[PDB]
Design a protein around this ligand. Structure first.
Ligand SMILES: CCNC(=O)c1ccc2c(c1)nc(C)n2[C@H]1CCN(CC2(O)CCCCC2)C[C@@H]1C
Length: 126
């Protein structure tokens, strides 16, 4: 009948420990789309587009083969528009919106967590 493919999307980020003098960048981050289970999304995903902030060169980043990740460095938080394109042209692209998290919440800072993780769950239906 119907096919449901769970996914996780979001980002991870880590503070440099000091501001980089060359560009004022403070964090390294990775935005991603991953299958929840250990499997090959390229079977049904054509490409995943990650629209970054205007301060980034070539802000419309396209990933055609797994892993569907973009690693960059920066200093501020912004919204990333993630658009998932399917192999089947009859399947409308999936649009996700994700706020890039760089700064650790006081709760997680107190829990001694080193890296920021902002991950969300979704299910793609076919
Ligand atoms: C090449 C490296 N540049 C960057 O890393 C970068 C990141 C963010 C930037 C930026 C450059 N230049 C501006 C104006 N911003 C802003 C983008 C909107 N956000 C606002 C926000 O997205 C925050 C989280 C809560 C919701 C609103 C506030 C930000 C200072």
């Amino acid at each position: 009948v119907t096919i449901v493919k769970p996914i996780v999307y979001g980002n991870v980020a880590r503070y440099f420990g000091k501001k980089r003098e060359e560009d004022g960048h403070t964090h390294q981050w990775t935005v991603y789309v991953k299958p929840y289970r250990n499997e090959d999304m390229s079977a049904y995903v054509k490409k995943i587009q990650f629209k970054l902030h205007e301060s980034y060169g070539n802000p419309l980043r396209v990933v055609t083969k797994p892993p569907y990740e973009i690693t960059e460095t920066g200093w501020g938080e912004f919204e990333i528009i993630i658009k998932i394109f399917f192999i089947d042209p009859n399947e409308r692209p999936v649009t996700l919106y994700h706020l890039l998290k760089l700064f650790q919440s006081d709760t997680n800072a107190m829990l001694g967590k080193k890296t920021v993780v902002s991950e969300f769950y979704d299910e793609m239906i076919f």
